[PDB]
Design an enzyme around this catalytic site. Structure first.
Site, PDB file in Angstrom:
ATOM      1  CG  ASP A  44      -2.284   0.577   1.004  1.00  0.00           C
ATOM      2  OD1 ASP A  44      -2.305   1.778   0.728  1.00  0.00           O
ATOM      3  OD2 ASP A  44      -3.331  -0.075   1.157  1.00  0.00           O
ATOM      4  CG  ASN A  83       0.960   8.870   1.429  1.00  0.00           C
ATOM      5  OD1 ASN A  83       0.693   8.197   0.439  1.00  0.00           O
ATOM      6  ND2 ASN A  83       1.454  10.097   1.351  1.00  0.00           N
ATOM      7  CG  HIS A  85      -5.862   2.377   2.650  1.00  0.00           C
ATOM      8  ND1 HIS A  85      -5.613   1.078   2.263  1.00  0.00           N
ATOM      9  CD2 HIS A  85      -7.198   2.459   2.859  1.00  0.00           C
ATOM     10  CE1 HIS A  85      -6.752   0.407   2.230  1.00  0.00           C
ATOM     11  NE2 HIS A  85      -7.729   1.221   2.585  1.00  0.00           N
ATOM     12  CB  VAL A  96      -0.154  -4.526  20.067  1.00  0.00           C
ATOM     13  CG1 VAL A  96       0.083  -5.004  21.484  1.00  0.00           C
ATOM     14  CG2 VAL A  96       1.130  -4.584  19.244  1.00  0.00           C
ATOM     15  CB  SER A 144      -6.609  -2.857  -0.251  1.00  0.00           C
ATOM     16  OG  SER A 144      -6.686  -3.664   0.909  1.00  0.00           O
ATOM     17  CD1 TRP A 145      -4.630  -0.169  -2.192  1.00  0.00           C
ATOM     18  CD2 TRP A 145      -6.594   0.709  -2.847  1.00  0.00           C
ATOM     19  NE1 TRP A 145      -5.160   0.523  -1.133  1.00  0.00           N
ATOM     20  CE2 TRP A 145      -6.364   1.065  -1.502  1.00  0.00           C
ATOM     21  CE3 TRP A 145      -7.769   1.160  -3.475  1.00  0.00           C
ATOM     22  CZ2 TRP A 145      -7.268   1.852  -0.767  1.00  0.00           C
ATOM     23  CZ3 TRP A 145      -8.675   1.906  -2.744  1.00  0.00           C
ATOM     24  CH2 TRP A 145      -8.413   2.259  -1.397  1.00  0.00           C
ATOM     25  CD  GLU A 148      -7.854   5.181 -11.670  1.00  0.00           C
ATOM     26  OE1 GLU A 148      -7.257   6.243 -11.882  1.00  0.00           O
ATOM     27  OE2 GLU A 148      -8.674   5.012 -10.741  1.00  0.00           O
ATOM     28  CB  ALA A 183      -9.548  -5.555  -2.051  1.00  0.00           C
ATOM     29  CD  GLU A 222     -14.928  -3.503  -9.058  1.00  0.00           C
ATOM     30  OE1 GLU A 222     -14.606  -4.217 -10.047  1.00  0.00           O
ATOM     31  OE2 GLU A 222     -14.171  -2.603  -8.635  1.00  0.00           O
ATOM     32  CB  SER A 259      -9.581  -0.970  -0.053  1.00  0.00           C
ATOM     33  OG  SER A 259     -10.676  -0.054  -0.065  1.00  0.00           O
TER      34      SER A 259
HETATM   35  C1  I0W Z   1       2.523  -2.740 -19.850  1.00  0.00           C
HETATM   36  C2  I0W Z   1       2.894  -2.240 -18.460  1.00  0.00           C
HETATM   37  O1  I0W Z   1       4.065  -2.175 -18.111  1.00  0.00           O
HETATM   38  N1  I0W Z   1       1.880  -1.896 -17.689  1.00  0.00           N
HETATM   39  C3  I0W Z   1       2.113  -1.400 -16.318  1.00  0.00           C
HETATM   40  C4  I0W Z   1       0.795  -1.285 -15.578  1.00  0.00           C
HETATM   41  C5  I0W Z   1       0.176  -2.657 -15.321  1.00  0.00           C
HETATM   42  C6  I0W Z   1      -1.127  -2.473 -14.551  1.00  0.00           C
HETATM   43  N2  I0W Z   1      -0.925  -1.784 -13.233  1.00  0.00           N
HETATM   44  C7  I0W Z   1      -2.253  -1.650 -12.567  1.00  0.00           C
HETATM   45  C8  I0W Z   1      -2.103  -1.161 -11.114  1.00  0.00           C
HETATM   46  C9  I0W Z   1      -2.300   0.179 -10.806  1.00  0.00           C
HETATM   47  C10 I0W Z   1      -2.159   0.606  -9.495  1.00  0.00           C
HETATM   48  O2  I0W Z   1      -2.325   1.922  -9.257  1.00  0.00           O
HETATM   49  C11 I0W Z   1      -2.730   2.416  -8.065  1.00  0.00           C
HETATM   50  C12 I0W Z   1      -2.085   3.549  -7.580  1.00  0.00           C
HETATM   51  C13 I0W Z   1      -2.530   4.139  -6.401  1.00  0.00           C
HETATM   52  C14 I0W Z   1      -3.613   3.603  -5.718  1.00  0.00           C
HETATM   53  N3  I0W Z   1      -4.042   4.168  -4.566  1.00  0.00           N
HETATM   54  C15 I0W Z   1      -3.330   5.297  -3.960  1.00  0.00           C
HETATM   55  C16 I0W Z   1      -4.248   6.170  -3.097  1.00  0.00           C
HETATM   56  N4  I0W Z   1      -5.111   5.404  -2.187  1.00  0.00           N
HETATM   57  C17 I0W Z   1      -5.953   6.277  -1.331  1.00  0.00           C
HETATM   58  C18 I0W Z   1      -6.831   5.394  -0.309  1.00  0.00           C
HETATM   59  C19 I0W Z   1      -7.090   6.259   0.874  1.00  0.00           C
HETATM   60  O3  I0W Z   1      -6.375   7.253   1.109  1.00  0.00           O
HETATM   61  O4  I0W Z   1      -8.009   5.847   1.595  1.00  0.00           O
HETATM   62  C20 I0W Z   1      -5.966   4.530  -3.010  1.00  0.00           C
HETATM   63  C21 I0W Z   1      -5.130   3.552  -3.816  1.00  0.00           C
HETATM   64  N5  I0W Z   1      -4.213   2.496  -6.179  1.00  0.00           N
HETATM   65  C22 I0W Z   1      -3.811   1.885  -7.370  1.00  0.00           C
HETATM   66  N6  I0W Z   1      -1.868  -0.244  -8.512  1.00  0.00           N
HETATM   67  C23 I0W Z   1      -1.690  -1.550  -8.767  1.00  0.00           C
HETATM   68  C24 I0W Z   1      -1.334  -2.391  -7.696  1.00  0.00           C
HETATM   69  C25 I0W Z   1      -1.729  -2.128  -6.391  1.00  0.00           C
HETATM   70  C26 I0W Z   1      -1.327  -2.943  -5.342  1.00  0.00           C
HETATM   71 CL1  I0W Z   1      -1.860  -2.612  -3.715  1.00  0.00          CL
HETATM   72  C27 I0W Z   1      -0.494  -4.021  -5.571  1.00  0.00           C
HETATM   73  C28 I0W Z   1      -0.046  -4.266  -6.861  1.00  0.00           C
HETATM   74 CL2  I0W Z   1       1.039  -5.590  -7.128  1.00  0.00          CL
HETATM   75  C29 I0W Z   1      -0.467  -3.457  -7.921  1.00  0.00           C
HETATM   76  C30 I0W Z   1      -1.812  -2.036 -10.072  1.00  0.00           C
HETATM   77  C31 I0W Z   1      -0.281  -0.475 -13.444  1.00  0.00           C
HETATM   78  C32 I0W Z   1       1.042  -0.611 -14.212  1.00  0.00           C
HETATM   79 CA    CA Z   2     -12.540  -3.024 -10.463  1.00  0.00          CA
HETATM   80 CA    CA Z   3      -4.379  -2.492  20.902  1.00  0.00          CA
HETATM   81 NA    NA Z   4      -9.539  -1.981  -7.180  1.00  0.00          NA
END
Ligand code: I0W
Ligand code: CA
Ligand code: CA
Ligand code: NA
Ligand code: NAG
Ligand code: CA
Ligand code: CL
Ligand code: NA
Ligand code: NA
Ligand code: NA
Length: 471
Positions: A44, A83, A85, A96, A144-145, A148, A183, A222, A259
């Site tokens: 995360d 940051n 999450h 704990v 958890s992510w 998009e 997730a 979903e 998430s």
């Molecule tokens: C051809 C090539 O080379 N193609 C590279 C691509 C392949 C597909 N991949 C998709 C992907 C986007 C992404 O992008 C994000 C970026 C930020 C966030 N955020 C940040 C802010 N957060 C706020 C929550 C709050 O504050 O409550 C929400 C989540 N999420 C998804 N992640 C993940 C991912 C997430 C986790 Cl965990 C573990 C792994 Cl392995 C992959 C995957 C992106 C690069």
């Molecule tokens: Ca989805």
């Molecule tokens: Ca505790």
């Molecule tokens: Na997602």
């Protein structure tokens, strides 16, 4: 057994409930399982390693910063409390117990770390270095992510990340396989359909959805056939939320979404691995299928599969049951090696038009070392063109009559790029015999005169040929 004394434990209704709307975690603790010896990592935006409710369980060997290329995953602090999450998720797993602070983790004696990977550009290399972190030290990874959750994206792990999944499940954890918990997504209000997320749609990830406190499908959920099970999370403003550690050495009572469900599942899996450290990555998925509970989860799509289990695209096999998981783990017999039966279905490309049905009777590799009589995951790997992707709905019916939705209509998905060998996955035929007639249905759900062609349909069956239980 003495339950935790932490000030917010009574507010952790999904653990502390007296009324059967919970994950049955006290029953596991009372069997003696608390996560001792198990190592979990949160993938995360970082982890506040000095949080008063995390420091005692914090493990630098479960942590790294792939955004800044250093070992320290401490979050970047901002006025907007970006940051936070990863810290919330870490506490869900392993806060704990009995220390007068916040509440407790599901696995309150496990060791906990985090990979700071989402606070920067997420490339394939970043993902691979995170999934591949210290794989003979970390047992369980919680993510958890993904791509998009806009209801218009189709994407999954690129080459390095996919290689990391296969290295993890094959050589990770001393050859037993890393356990990747995912997730299933937060795209419900965008009508997202989660087999379009290649991370949750992977066989190598143990995918988790959410139920609200009153037992309903939350607004953000979903539906898809790749999901395996459910944990409680947030719902409407009359329903309680997740209570956990928060950034700046604080607690929160308002952690939410699917998430927040994956970390709770990771904690339950940690209790289960303490109960039997020899479980493989596939054994763990079998345990989830066998012990999860549909009761009191409301959905209009509960269906009984060919081996008598109820399954839903919103909930998989139902709510995780920690007491049942740890009990069944103790004397579990390791499953046989994984077989893979590849069936190229089409003899010619097929026009889709308004509707296309493809029927094929298969022997599931009869006479071969990959003969499968006991299915685990099944995939329909489809290559097709279509003028508006989101108007398609796709279903796959197994020989035992189980109708898996591979893709629901996605109104926001205007793409004209179709699907390029996209491996739609279902868990709903687990333990069925896959020999016999399979039926693929592709339908245009719109009144528009849409058009395209299915050029490849590979049915890929995974499973074994031994060890089945009476339906
Ligand atoms: C051809 C090539 O080379 N193609 C590279 C691509 C392949 C597909 N991949 C998709 C992907 C986007 C992404 O992008 C994000 C970026 C930020 C966030 N955020 C940040 C802010 N957060 C706020 C929550 C709050 O504050 O409550 C929400 C989540 N999420 C998804 N992640 C993940 C991912 C997430 C986790 Cl965990 C573990 C792994 Cl392995 C992959 C995957 C992106 C690069
Ligand atoms: Ca989805
Ligand atoms: Ca505790
Ligand atoms: Na997602
Ligand atoms: C783990 O399971 C394998 C496969 O069944 C078995 O060969 C091995 O003896 C087991 N190890 C332990 C420590 O139980
Ligand atoms: Ca750092
Ligand atoms: Cl494979
Ligand atoms: Na998965
Ligand atoms: Na049925
Ligand atoms: Na059959």
């Amino acid at each position: 057994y003495q339950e935790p004394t932490d000030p917010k434990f009574p507010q952790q209704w999904y653990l502390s409930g007296v009324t059967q709307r919970d994950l049955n975690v006290k029953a596991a603790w009372a069997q003696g399982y608390t996560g001792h010896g198990i190592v979990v990592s949160i993938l995360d935006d970082g982890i506040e390693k000095n949080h008063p409710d995390l420091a005692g369980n914090y493990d630098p060997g479960a942590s790294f910063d792939v955004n800044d290329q250093d070992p320290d995953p401490q979050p970047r602090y901002t006025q907007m409390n970006d940051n936070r999450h990863g810290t919330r998720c870490a506490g869900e797993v392993a806060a704990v117990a009995n220390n007068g602070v916040c509440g407790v983790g599901v696995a309150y004696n496990a060791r906990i770390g985090g990979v700071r990977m989402l606070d920067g550009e997420v490339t394939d290399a970043v993902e691979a270095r995170s999934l591949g972190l210290n794989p003979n030290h970390i047992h369980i990874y919680s993510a958890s992510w993904g791509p998009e959750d806009d209801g218009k994206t189709v994407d999954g792990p690129a080459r390095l990340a996919e290689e990391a999944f296969f290295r993890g499940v094959s050589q990770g954890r001393g050859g037993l396989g890393s356990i990747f918990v995912w997730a299933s997504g937060n795209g419900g209000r965008e009508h997202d359909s989660c087999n379009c997320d290649g991370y949750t749609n992977s066989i190598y990830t143990l995918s988790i959805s959410s139920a609200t406190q009153f037992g309903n499908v939350p607004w953000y959920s979903e539906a898809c056939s790749s999901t395996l099970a459910t944990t409680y999370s947030s719902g409407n403003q009359n329903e309680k939320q997740i209570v956990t550690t928060d950034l700046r050495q604080k607690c929160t009572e308002s952690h939410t979404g699917t998430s927040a469900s994956a970390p709770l599942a990771a904690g339950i899996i940690a209790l289960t691995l303490e109960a039997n450290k020899n479980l493989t990555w596939r054994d763990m998925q079998h345990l989830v299928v066998q012990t999860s509970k549909p009761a009191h989860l409301n959905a209009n799509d509960w269906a009984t599969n060919g081996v008598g289990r109820k399954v839903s695209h919103s909930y998989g096999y139902g709510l995780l049951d920690a007491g049942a998981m740890v009990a069944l783990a103790q004397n579990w017999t390791t499953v046989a090696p994984q077989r893979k039966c590849i069936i190229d279905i089409l003899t010619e490309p097929k026009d889709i038009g308004k509707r296309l049905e493809v029927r094929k009777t298969v022997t599931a590799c009869l006479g071969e070392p990959n003969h499968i009589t006991r299915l685990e995951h099944a995939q329909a790997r489809l290559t097709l063109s279509y003028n508006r992707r989101g108007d398609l709905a796709i279903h796959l019916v197994s020989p035992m009559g189980t109708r898996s939705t591979l893709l629901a209509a996605r109104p926001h998905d205007y793409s004209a790029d179709g699907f390029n060998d996209w491996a739609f996955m279902t868990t709903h035929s687990w333990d069925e015999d896959p020999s016999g007639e399979w039926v693929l249905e592709i339908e245009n759900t719109s009144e528009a005169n849409n058009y395209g062609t299915l050029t490849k349909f590979t049915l890929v069956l995974y499973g074994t040929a031994s060890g089945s239980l009476v339906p």
